[PDB]
Structures are given as C-alpha cells and as structure tokens.
C-alpha cells in the first residue's frame, strides 16, 4: 500500500524555478532517501538528486549544482525539490522514486509523474480553435486525433464521429 | 574401524549472534553528577580487564550490520529521555513574546540575540509577573519598537528543560556481553571496514567508548595507527557516508566569548525556570580556532589515501555543505552545557590534484537552547544558561565525508562533508568489534565405545594453556585438551568478578529499579542461566551428566563425513569441525537422546526387573 | 510408537515409564519448534518492550 504521489503538471518560461511536490505514505517516510528521477521523450533516464528525510542531507549531480535543490518536511511526509533557473533542454518528466528495502540502487516504487514543459507562447493560445495549452475537452451534443506541434507552439487537432471547452478561455 | 559419536562440553566453539548488552564503566567517584550517560548505574568494570589473543583465528564481522552501533544508539536515545523526565516543563513558556534587540552598535553587528520581557506565571495562581529573558535569532519565529515573537516549538511540540544538575559531559562507558557470550576484537593495524581480520582477540567488554554528539567532525575518538584509514560500505556507492579515523589527533579551540549571566524566576511552586540575564562586556560571535598548518598537514594525509581507490591522476577537491537543517550543514557540538553550530566552510575549500603566517583558522558559530536531539517528533529540549565564559578545547580524530556524484567520471572528484545520522558516530568506534555466543557441545567421531551394560594420573603442571578460547584457532585434538577452561566461563564472571560477582553491592540495582541498565542486567542474567542449564538438560538426556568428556554407544553413520579419525584430530579447528556436522547436528541430537540414553534406562531397569 | 509429549499419561504405567527422555526435554526450554526461550533471542523485543 506504499505509493508515490507528484505534484501537477505545470508550464512556465525559462527562468522560472519550479518546485515539485513527492507525497509519501504507507511506510515510515523517516526511513529511505527519496531520489529525483527526470526523463526526455527522446532520451532515457537521469538521476538528478537523493534526499534523506532525517536531516534533510542532499547530494545533488555535477551539472545541476547551483541550478537545483532538495527539501523536505517530517509532518507532511513530503519531499520537495526546487529546480532554478530551468531551460529549454530541461524539459521532460519529472520522477520521484524510493529505493527497494535491498539498499542497493534499485527502485522498487515510483509517482506517478510531473509534466514540465518550457516554452514561449501566449497563455491564452470539427475544426479546432487555437486552444493553447495543449488539454483540450470535445464532447458531442453535450474519433478523436492528437494534435500537432506547430512552429509557434500553437496545437490544432480534429474530431470526427462539439463546442470544445478551452481551459485558457474558461467558456 | 569402529566409529562412535563423542559429546564434549566447553569447546571453543562459538556462533555471531544479538544479545542485550549491559554496561560497565569505571568509577571515577563515589559521588550532585547524576551524569546523564550513567547515573553510575552501568557497574564497574574489575581494575583489571583480561583480553586473550586467539592464534590462528581468522574470524572476519561486517563494520556495517554490526548489531552494536544499534544497541548503543537506541541506548543513548533511551538514556536521555529518563534524565528529562524528572525536570521541570516549560509549558507555560509558550507566550507571545514581545522582544528588542539587545544594545550594539549595527555596523554589519545584526546580533541574533533578542531581550524579550513576557507575562510569566508565578506561584501563586491569581497573580502574574512580567519578566524579561534573552533569546537567540534561532530560537524564536515571528509572529504577525518592539514587535511580537513566538518560541520555535509551540507550533510543533512541547518543549522541556533539562535539569541544571545533570552533566553532559561524555565518560567512557564500556559495554560488556551476558554470560555465555563473547566479544571479539580486530588488533589489525590496517583492517579494513568488512573482511577477514587476520589477528583476533576476544575481551568480555570493549575499551570505553566516549558518546560524543558530533555532526561533521569526530571528536575525542581513537586514533588511527599510521596511514589515516578511510571506511566505507561501498565507496563506489554515493549513498553510504566515508567514515574516516585519524592517526594524529588535530586539537581544535572553541569558545564563548558573551559573558551571559543566569537568571532563575520562579514560574511555579518548586518550579524555577533559568533565563538569560544582563549581558556583561563587548558583543561577540562564538568561534572555533583550529591550527592551519596541522589542519592543511592532516588534509594532506586523508587525500593521499583516497587516490588509491579512484587512481593517481584524479582532480580531489573539497566543498561545502550542499543543504540540510541546520543540524547537517554545521558542526554541530556540545561543551560547557551549550550546543554549538560552526560553519566549516573554512575547513573544506581546496583543491588537489596529483603532487606539488602560521595563523589559526577560525569558525563562526551559532548557538541555540532550543533543540530536538536526533530528529526527534513531539519533544524539544531547552538547555539552562551558562554562567560565565566558556571554552573547548576538544581533539579532532575523524571527518564522515560524501561522494558528490554526477555523470561524468574520472574528471572531478569532490567530498562534501555531512552528518546524516549519529548512528555514524558509533560505527567509528565499534568497528572493532563483534558479539558471539559460544556453544560447548561439540560431537565428534571416535573409536571409544560405552562400557558394557553387563559390567560394573597426572595431578598438574598441565603447560601452555592459552586462555578462555584461546584453542579457538588450535587443531580439535590440542582443543580438546583444555575443556575447564570454558565450563568456568559459560556461566557468572569470565574474568575478575566480571558480572554476577560484581551485581552483588546494595542499593546499585534497588536505587536504580528498572531505570536503564536495571532491566539490562535482568535480561542478561536470566539468559545466562537458561543457556547454561539449556546444555545440562541436553546431557541429563543424554547421559554424560558431570563428565566433560564422555563416549556413549552410538554408530557414527559414514555419511555424515567420509574424513578418518587422524584427518580429523590431526589439523582442524573445532570451528570448521562445527560447520560441516552442522547439517546434521540436530539428528545426531535426536539419536543420542532416547535411543543412547532411554533405551539404557528402559533395559538397565528390566535387568533387575524381578 | 512413541506419542509425543505427555502421550503416556493414559497408557499404563509400565508402558508410560518406557518414555522419560520425552517429558525431560520439555521440562525446561521451549516445549516445541522454539516454543519460548529460542524466541526470546531476538533483539529490541523487549528492550523496546
Ligand atoms: C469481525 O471480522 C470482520 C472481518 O475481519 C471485521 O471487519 C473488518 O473491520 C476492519 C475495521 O475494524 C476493516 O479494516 C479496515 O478496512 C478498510 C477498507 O479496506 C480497504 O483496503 C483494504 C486493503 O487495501 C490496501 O492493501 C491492498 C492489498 O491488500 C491494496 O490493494 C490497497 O491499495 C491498499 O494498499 C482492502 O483489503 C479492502 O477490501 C478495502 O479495499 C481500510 O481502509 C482500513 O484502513 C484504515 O483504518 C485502519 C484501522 O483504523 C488503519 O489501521 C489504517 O491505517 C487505515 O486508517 C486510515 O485512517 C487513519 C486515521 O487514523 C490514518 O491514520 C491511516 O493512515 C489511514 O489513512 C489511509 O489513507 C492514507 C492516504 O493514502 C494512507 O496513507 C494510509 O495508509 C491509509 O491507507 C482498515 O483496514 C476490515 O477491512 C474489515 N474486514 C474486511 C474483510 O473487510 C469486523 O470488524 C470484526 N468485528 C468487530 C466487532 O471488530
Ligand atoms: C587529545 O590528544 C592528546 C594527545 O595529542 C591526548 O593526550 C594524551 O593522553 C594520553 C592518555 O589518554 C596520555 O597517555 C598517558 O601517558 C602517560 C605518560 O607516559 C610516559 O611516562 C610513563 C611513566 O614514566 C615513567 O618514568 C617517569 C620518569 O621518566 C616516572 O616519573 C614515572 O613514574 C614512570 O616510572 C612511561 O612509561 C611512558 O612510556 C611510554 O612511551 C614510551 C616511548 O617513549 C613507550 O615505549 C611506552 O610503551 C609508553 O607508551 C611515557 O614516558 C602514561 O604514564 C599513561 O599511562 C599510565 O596511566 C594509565 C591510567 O592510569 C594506566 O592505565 C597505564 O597503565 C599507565 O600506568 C602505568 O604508569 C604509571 C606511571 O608510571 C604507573 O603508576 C602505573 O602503575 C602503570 O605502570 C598514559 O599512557 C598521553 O601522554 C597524552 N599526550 C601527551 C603528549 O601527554 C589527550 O588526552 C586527548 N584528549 C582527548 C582525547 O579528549
Ligand atoms: C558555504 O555555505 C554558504 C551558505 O550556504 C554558501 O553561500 C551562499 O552563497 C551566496 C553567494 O554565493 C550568499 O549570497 C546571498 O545572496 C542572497 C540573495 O541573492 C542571491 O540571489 C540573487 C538574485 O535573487 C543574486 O543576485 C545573488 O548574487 C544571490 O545569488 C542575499 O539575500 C544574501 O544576503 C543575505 O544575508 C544578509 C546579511 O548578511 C541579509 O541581510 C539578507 O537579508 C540575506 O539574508 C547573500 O548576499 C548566501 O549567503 C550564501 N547562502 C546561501 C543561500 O547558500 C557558500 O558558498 C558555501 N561555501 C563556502 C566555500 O563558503
Ligand atoms: C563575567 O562577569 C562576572 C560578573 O558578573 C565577572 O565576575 C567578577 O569577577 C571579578 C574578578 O575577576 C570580581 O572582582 C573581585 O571582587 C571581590 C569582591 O568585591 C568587593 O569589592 C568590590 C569593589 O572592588 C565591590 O564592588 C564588591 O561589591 C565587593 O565589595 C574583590 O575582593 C576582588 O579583589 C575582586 O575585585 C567581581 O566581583 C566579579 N563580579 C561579581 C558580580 O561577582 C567575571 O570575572 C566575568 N568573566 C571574566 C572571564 O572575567
Ligand atoms: C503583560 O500583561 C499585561 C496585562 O496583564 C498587558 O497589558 C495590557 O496590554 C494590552 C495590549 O496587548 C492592552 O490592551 C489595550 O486594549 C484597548 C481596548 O480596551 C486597546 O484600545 C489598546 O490598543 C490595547 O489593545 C491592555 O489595556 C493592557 N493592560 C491591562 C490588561 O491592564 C501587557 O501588554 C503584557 N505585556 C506583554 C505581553 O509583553
Ligand atoms: C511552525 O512554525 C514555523 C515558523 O513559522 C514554520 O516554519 C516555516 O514554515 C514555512 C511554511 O509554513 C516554511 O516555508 C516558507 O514558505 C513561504 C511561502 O512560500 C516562504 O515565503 C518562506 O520564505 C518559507 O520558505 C519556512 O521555511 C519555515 N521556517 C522555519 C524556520 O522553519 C513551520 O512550518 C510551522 N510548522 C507547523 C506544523 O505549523
Ligand atoms: C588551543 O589553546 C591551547 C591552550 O589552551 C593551545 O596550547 C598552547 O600551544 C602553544 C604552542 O602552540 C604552547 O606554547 C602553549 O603553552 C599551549 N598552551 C598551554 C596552556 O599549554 C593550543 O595551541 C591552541 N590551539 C589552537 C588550534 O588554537
Ligand atoms: C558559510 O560560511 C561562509 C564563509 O566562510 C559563507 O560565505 C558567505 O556568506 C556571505 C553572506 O553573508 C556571502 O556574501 C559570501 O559570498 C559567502 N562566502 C562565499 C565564499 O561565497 C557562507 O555563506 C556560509 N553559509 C552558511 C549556510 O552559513
Ligand atoms: C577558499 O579559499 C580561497 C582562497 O584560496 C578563497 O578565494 C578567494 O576568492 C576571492 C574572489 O572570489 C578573492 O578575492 C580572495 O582574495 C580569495 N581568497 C584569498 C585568501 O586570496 C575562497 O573564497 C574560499 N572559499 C570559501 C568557501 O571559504
Ligand atoms: C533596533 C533593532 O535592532 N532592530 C533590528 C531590525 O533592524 C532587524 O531587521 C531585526 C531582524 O530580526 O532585528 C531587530
Ligand atoms: C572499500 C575497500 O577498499 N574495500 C576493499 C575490498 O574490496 C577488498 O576485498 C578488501 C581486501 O582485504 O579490502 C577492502
Ligand atoms: C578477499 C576479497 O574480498 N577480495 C576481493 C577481490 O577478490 C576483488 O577482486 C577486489 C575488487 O576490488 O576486492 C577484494
Ligand atoms: C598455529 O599457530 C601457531 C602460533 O600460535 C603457528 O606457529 C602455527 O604454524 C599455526 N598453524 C596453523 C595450521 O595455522
Ligand atoms: C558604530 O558602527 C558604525 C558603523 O558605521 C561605525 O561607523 C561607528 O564608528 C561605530 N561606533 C561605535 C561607538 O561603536
Ligand atoms: C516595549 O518596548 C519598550 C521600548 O523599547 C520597552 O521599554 C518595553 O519594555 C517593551 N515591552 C513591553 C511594553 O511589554
Ligand atoms: C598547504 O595547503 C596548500 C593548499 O591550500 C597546499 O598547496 C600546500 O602544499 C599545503 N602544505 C603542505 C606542506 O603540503
Ligand atoms: C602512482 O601512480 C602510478 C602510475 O599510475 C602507479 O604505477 C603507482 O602504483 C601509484 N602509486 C601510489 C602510491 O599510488
Ligand atoms: C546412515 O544413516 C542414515 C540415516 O541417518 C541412513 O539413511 C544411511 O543409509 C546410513 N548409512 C550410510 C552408509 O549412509
Ligand atoms: C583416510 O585416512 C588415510 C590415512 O590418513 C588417508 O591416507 C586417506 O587418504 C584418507 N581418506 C579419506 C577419504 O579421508
Ligand atoms: C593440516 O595440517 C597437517 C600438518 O599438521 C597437514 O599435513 C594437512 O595437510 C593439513 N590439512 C589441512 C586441510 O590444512
Ligand atoms: C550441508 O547440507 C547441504 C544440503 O542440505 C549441502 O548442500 C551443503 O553442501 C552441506 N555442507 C556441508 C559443509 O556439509
């Protein structure tokens, strides 16, 4: 019954610093390191930090020195780590994992995820409108495709078998 | 030809095992101490301890699963919170504090200190008093020219004082194994942290080990002899700490310089809370003074010695704390009755790479009363005032560094110290050592046979006897020769009135009742005595009842061994006699109780049955 | 035929007198599979308790 739980997926522009949040519970969360795991569409897996809950004692990797940092609170049972200064070639899915009870570098339970996306574009954004972010809700009366990634940033996508509700509109 | 099984009591045979260990410590005074560690409740060790070299012994214990550093640990824990628990609470101190800062000149000389005055109770219930304190920067949070400010813990946890009378000092304790078991020490000069320790001793209870809270560096530990020896569960592995000992001693000056007065306003019928008073002279930081030649000369010794391990040719450098509470990031330690945090940002930036004034460094320090010991939830501890000024004077004997990690390898390599856990801080001490339990029934195969149902000397200067265990390492036919030896030992004292003996005195154990130790010694004394009668049960069955040696009639199946008398007895250890029997050992067990011994009884009767 | 520990208490006492070594282990120690004093080895069960 031990399970991860990440924060929400969130966008932001270069420079921004976002915070992730890694839930824990099942287990005494006083106990393991929790590690930060990020993975690209394109790329496999990095190892980006460990922190122990007791102490708050963190080791953070070469490249991400003085870019990233790692916290957490004992009454929450929550780890957080705080990327600053992000960039375009950072953008991928955020992990938050826990070593097997083996104590070596295996990892026997994971979160669900975090999508951060870095970019460039307006936050305002059947034929489709201009509904940028990329969430889009088509309904009929009350088949769909994926979209596509224009060179603006913009998404389009169809549906065939509307009135599509737009987060960024909120109709 | 004819092979018959052979029971034989007080072999140096022994098995690694966790057993409660209870305490033994000098007596530095008849004598308020009350130190915390030991209210003189671990009893004294014997003036003179006795420690038996094994020859021939290559018995190796893992430094990391080591069940010692636990017991300690837990014990230290334990021990605090009965000392607490007689003291008086600061309940009532949870108030909105209104506080100024306390008269300098901000030259920036931002002074974490506060002067609070506060609506304090007193001893009678309908009446109050507004009294005034003084309070680090860091026991205090702001609450939304004096402004409101509110203690750390209320929002948290309750808060409690430590009596003034109790010392924190640290005293050797020595902890010793219950009767029937045995502790065994590597005198291995280069031992490493995990693997075969080719010179072992045993000793009933290790050499004092003095419990020293210290963060990020060891402090008043046993040196090292010769190169400085660097300790790891895998270096390769970033997660496991570097423990590192020293062999020359690096003697470290830390002081106090406010001259803070105490200031006792009652709070409570037989209650009396301790607050800081006016603070006489000049305004001063807490520093650390450590010599820069040693230290440089000492940084040199610890990075010639990790180059064996990443190569010769490697960039080492040496970095800062990279995050944590406060308790990590600084060296964290006590003296005089305060709790010290230095920045040792000083100490560790520099950089190494292959070969090629005379002033002290010196530490900023912080201080704080309000504290939470071992990561602790629910409780806090606020530390009296100390009158006066104080120093320290303390001697560095090891650092617990870390592997800083990334993807690239073989171009940079960087340490960062850190103090995760206080558990570390035992491992740098009982490394060298190991708890067993010794088994003296050892069965072997000889050619004797009982003496037939229908039918019915040397006085001394036996030579070279080698101790308790001592015929660990010795072929089974020389171990055999030294059988009393053991059978002393299984049960009370193994050397000088070493338990049972010494738990004689009056008002040691009834003062003490079940607090700490006393229900350590209870545990320890009753296993004594159920393992030594557990083996006399097991011969009441099977015969042999006051022989040492004796030989029933029982076959020795070939199956169990295809080795001859002369192989056997010629050049083995019991030990490795006790590994290869020990998938059979529990039939032969079986065999040798009824059917060796009951079938005699049930026809030694029948025999004179009219 | 052997019948285990306090087997022979309905069997005569003749018979009952062919099995002592069973009662006599289990006198003191665990009666069977590490009934108690085996199981009071292990550590922090009662420390903590
Ligand atoms: C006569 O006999 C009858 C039969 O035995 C008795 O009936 C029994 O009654 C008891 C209660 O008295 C029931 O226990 C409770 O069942 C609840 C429902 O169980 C669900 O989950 C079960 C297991 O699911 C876990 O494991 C499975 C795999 O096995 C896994 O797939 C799943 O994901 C999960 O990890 C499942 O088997 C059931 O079918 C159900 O799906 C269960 O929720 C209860 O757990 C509560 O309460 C108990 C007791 O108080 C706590 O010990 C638990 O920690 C948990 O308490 C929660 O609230 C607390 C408040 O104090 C929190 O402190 C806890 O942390 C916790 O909060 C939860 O959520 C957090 C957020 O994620 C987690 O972090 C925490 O871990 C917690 O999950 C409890 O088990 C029996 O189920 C029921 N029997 C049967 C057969 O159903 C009858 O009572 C007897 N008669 C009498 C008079 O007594
Ligand atoms: C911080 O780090 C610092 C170091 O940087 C730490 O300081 C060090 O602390 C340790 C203790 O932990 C000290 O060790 C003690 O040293 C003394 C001194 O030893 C010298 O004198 C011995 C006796 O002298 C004889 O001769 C003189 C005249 O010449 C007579 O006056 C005496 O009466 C004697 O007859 C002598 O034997 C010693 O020889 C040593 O050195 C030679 C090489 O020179 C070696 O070969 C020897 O093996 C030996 O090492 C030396 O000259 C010792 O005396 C202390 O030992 C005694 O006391 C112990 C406690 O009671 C006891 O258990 C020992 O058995 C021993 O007692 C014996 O000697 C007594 C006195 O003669 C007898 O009465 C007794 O019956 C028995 O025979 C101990 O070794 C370090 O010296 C000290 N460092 C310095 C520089 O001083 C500091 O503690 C650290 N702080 C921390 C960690 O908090
Ligand atoms: C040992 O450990 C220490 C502590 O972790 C490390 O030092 C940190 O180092 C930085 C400089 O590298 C210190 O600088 C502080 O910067 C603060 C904010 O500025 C940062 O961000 C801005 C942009 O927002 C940048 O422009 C700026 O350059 C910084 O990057 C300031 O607010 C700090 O002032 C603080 O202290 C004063 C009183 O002294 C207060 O009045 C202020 O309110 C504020 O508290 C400061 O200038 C920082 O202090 C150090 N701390 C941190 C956060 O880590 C060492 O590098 C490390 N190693 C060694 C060898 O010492
Ligand atoms: C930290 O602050 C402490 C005060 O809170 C300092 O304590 C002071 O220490 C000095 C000596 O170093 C004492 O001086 C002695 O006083 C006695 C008695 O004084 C009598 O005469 C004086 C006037 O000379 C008078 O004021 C007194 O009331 C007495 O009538 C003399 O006999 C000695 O010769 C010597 O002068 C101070 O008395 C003592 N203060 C207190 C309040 O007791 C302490 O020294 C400071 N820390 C450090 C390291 O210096
Ligand atoms: C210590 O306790 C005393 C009371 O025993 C405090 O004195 C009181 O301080 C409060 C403000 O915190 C005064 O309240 C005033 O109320 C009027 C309205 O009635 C308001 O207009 C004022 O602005 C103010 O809020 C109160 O009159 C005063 N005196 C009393 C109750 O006799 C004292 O401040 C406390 N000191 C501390 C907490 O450091
Ligand atoms: C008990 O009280 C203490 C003192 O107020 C709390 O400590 C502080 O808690 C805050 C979160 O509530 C920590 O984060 C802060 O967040 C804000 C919002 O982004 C930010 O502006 C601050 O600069 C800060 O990051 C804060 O670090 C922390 N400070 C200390 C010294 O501990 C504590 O959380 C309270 N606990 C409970 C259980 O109420
Ligand atoms: C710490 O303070 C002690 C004194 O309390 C210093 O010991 C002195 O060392 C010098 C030589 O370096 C001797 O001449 C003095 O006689 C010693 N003092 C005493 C009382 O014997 C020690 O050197 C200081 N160390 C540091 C790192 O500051
Ligand atoms: C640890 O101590 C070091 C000094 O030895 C601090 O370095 C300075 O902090 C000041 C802020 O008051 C900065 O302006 C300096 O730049 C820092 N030093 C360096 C070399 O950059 C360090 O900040 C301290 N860190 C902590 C957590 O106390
Ligand atoms: C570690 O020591 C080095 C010097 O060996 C410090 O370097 C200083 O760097 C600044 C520029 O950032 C120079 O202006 C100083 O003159 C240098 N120091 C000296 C003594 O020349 C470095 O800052 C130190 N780091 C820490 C954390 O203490
Ligand atoms: C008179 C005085 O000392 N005021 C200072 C204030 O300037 C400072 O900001 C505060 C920090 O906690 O401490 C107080
Ligand atoms: C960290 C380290 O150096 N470990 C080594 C280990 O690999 C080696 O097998 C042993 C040989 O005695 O010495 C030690
Ligand atoms: C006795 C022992 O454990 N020896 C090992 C050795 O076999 C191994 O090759 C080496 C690798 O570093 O570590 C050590
Ligand atoms: C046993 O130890 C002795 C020294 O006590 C040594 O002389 C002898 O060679 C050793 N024999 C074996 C087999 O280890
Ligand atoms: C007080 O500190 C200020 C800081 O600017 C300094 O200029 C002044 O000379 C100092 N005066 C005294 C009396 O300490
Ligand atoms: C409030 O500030 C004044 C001036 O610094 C001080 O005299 C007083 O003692 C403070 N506390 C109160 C009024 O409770
Ligand atoms: C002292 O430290 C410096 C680096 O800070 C180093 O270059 C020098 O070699 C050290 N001294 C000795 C005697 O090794
Ligand atoms: C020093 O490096 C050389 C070349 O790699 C190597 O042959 C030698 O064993 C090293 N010596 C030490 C003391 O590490
Ligand atoms: C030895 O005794 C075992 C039973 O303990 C039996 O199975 C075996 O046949 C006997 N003989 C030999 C030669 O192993
Ligand atoms: C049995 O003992 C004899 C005489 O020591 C020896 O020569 C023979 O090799 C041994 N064989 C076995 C199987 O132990
Ligand atoms: C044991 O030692 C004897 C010499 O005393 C030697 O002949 C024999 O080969 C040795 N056997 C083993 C297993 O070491
Ligand atoms: C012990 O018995 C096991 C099988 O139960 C066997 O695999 C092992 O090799 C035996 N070891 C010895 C030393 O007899």
């Known amino acids: 019954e031990v399970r991860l739980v990440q924060s929400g997926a969130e966008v932001k522009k270069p420079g921004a610093s976002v915070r992730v949040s890694c839930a824990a519970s099942?287990?005494?969360?006083?106990?393991?390191?929790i590690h930060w795991l990020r993975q690209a569409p394109g790329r496999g897996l990095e190892w980006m930090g460990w922190?122990?809950?007791?102490?708050?004692?963190?080791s953070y990797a070469r490249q991400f020195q003085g870019r990233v940092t790692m916290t957490r609170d004992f009454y929450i049972d929550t780890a957080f780590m705080d990327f600053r200064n992000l960039k375009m070639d950072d953008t991928a899915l955020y992990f938050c994992?826990?070593?097997?009870?083996?104590?070596?570098?295996?990892?026997?339970?994971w979160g669900q995820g975090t999508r951060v996306l870095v970019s460039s574009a307006s936050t305002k954004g059947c034929l489709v409108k201009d509904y940028f972010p990329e969430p889009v809700t088509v309904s009929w009366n009350s088949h769909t495709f994926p979209a596509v990634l224009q060179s603006s940033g913009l998404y389009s996508l169809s549906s065939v078998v509307c009135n599509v509700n737009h987060k960024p509109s909120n109709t | 030809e004819n092979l018959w099984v052979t029971v034989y009591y007080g072999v140096p045979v022994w098995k690694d095992a966790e057993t409660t260990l209870f305490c033994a410590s000098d007596a530095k005074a008849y004598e308020e101490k009350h130190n915390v560690w030991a209210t003189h409740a671990c009893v004294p060790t014997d003036p003179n301890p006795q420690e038996i070299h094994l020859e021939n012994v290559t018995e190796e214990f893992n430094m990391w699963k080591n069940n010692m550093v636990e017991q300690m640990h837990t014990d230290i824990i334990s021990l605090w919170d009965q000392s607490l628990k007689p003291c008086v609470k600061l309940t009532p101190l949870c108030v909105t504090l209104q506080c100024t800062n306390v008269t300098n000149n901000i030259t920036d000389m931002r002074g974490e200190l506060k002067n609070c005055s506060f609506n304090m109770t007193t001893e009678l219930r309908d009446k109050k008093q507004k009294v005034y304190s003084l309070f680090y920067r860091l026991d205090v949070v702001q609450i939304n020219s004096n402004k409101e400010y509110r203690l750390i813990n209320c929002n948290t946890s309750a808060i409690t004082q430590a009596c003034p009378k109790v010392s924190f000092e640290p005293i050797p304790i020595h902890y010793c194994a219950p009767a029937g078991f045995a502790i065994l020490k590597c005198k291995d000069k280069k031992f490493n942290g995990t693997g075969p320790c080719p010179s072992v001793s045993t000793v009933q209870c290790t050499h004092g080990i003095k419990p020293v809270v210290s963060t990020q560096l060891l402090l008043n530990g046993s040196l090292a002899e010769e190169e400085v020896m660097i300790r790891s569960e895998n270096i390769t592995n970033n997660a496991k700490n570097i423990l590192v000992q020293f062999n020359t001693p690096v003697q470290i000056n830390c002081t106090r310089p406010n001259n803070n007065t105490r200031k006792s306003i009652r709070i409570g019928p037989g209650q009396a809370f301790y607050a800081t008073g006016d603070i006489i002279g000049d305004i001063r930081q807490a520093h650390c003074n450590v010599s820069k030649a040693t230290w440089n000369e000492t940084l040199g010794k610890v990075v010639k010695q990790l180059r064996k391990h990443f190569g010769n040719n490697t960039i080492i450098r040496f970095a800062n704390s990279s995050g944590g509470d406060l308790e990590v990031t600084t060296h964290s330690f006590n003296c005089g009755g305060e709790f010290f945090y230095c920045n040792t940002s000083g100490l560790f930036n520099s950089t190494w790479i292959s070969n090629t004034s005379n002033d002290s460094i010196t530490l900023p320090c912080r201080i704080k009363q309000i504290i939470n010991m071992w990561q602790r939830i629910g409780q806090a501890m606020y530390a009296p005032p100390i009158q006066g000024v104080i120093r320290c004077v303390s001697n560095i004997t090891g650092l617990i560094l870390t592997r800083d990690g990334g993807s690239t390898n073989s171009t940079t390599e960087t340490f960062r110290p850190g103090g995760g856990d206080m558990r570390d801080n035992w491992r740098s001490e009982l490394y060298k050592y190991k708890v067993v339990k010794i088994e003296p029934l050892g069965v072997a195969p000889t050619r004797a046979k009982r003496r037939v149902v229908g039918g019915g000397s040397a006085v001394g200067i036996g030579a070279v006897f080698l101790g308790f265990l001592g015929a660990a390492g010795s072929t089974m036919g020389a171990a055999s020769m030294t059988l009393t030896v053991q059978a002393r030992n299984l049960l009370s004292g193994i050397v000088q009135q070493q338990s049972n003996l010494l738990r004689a005195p009056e008002a040691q154990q009834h003062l003490l009742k079940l607090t700490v130790w006393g229900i350590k010694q209870l545990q320890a004394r009753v296993l004594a005595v159920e393992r030594y009668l557990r083996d006399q049960q097991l011969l009441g069955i099977w015969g042999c009842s006051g022989k040492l040696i004796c030989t029933t009639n029982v076959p020795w199946n070939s199956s169990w061994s295809n080795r001859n008398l002369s192989e056997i007895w010629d050049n083995m250890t019991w030990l490795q006699w006790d590994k290869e029997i020990s998938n059979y050992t529990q039939i032969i067990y079986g065999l040798l109780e009824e059917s060796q011994n009951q079938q005699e009884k049930n026809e030694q009767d029948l025999l004179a049955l009219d | 035929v052997f019948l285990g520990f306090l087997g022979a208490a309905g069997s005569t006492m003749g018979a009952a007198s062919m099995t002592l070594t069973v009662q006599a282990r289990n006198l003191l120690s665990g009666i069977v599979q590490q009934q108690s004093n085996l199981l009071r080895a292990p550590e922090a069960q009662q420390h903590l308790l």
């Open positions: 099942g287990y005494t969360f006083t106990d393991f390191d």
């Open positions: 994992a826990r070593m097997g009870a083996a104590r070596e570098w295996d990892f026997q339970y």
């Open positions: 922190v122990r809950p007791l102490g708050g004692g963190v």
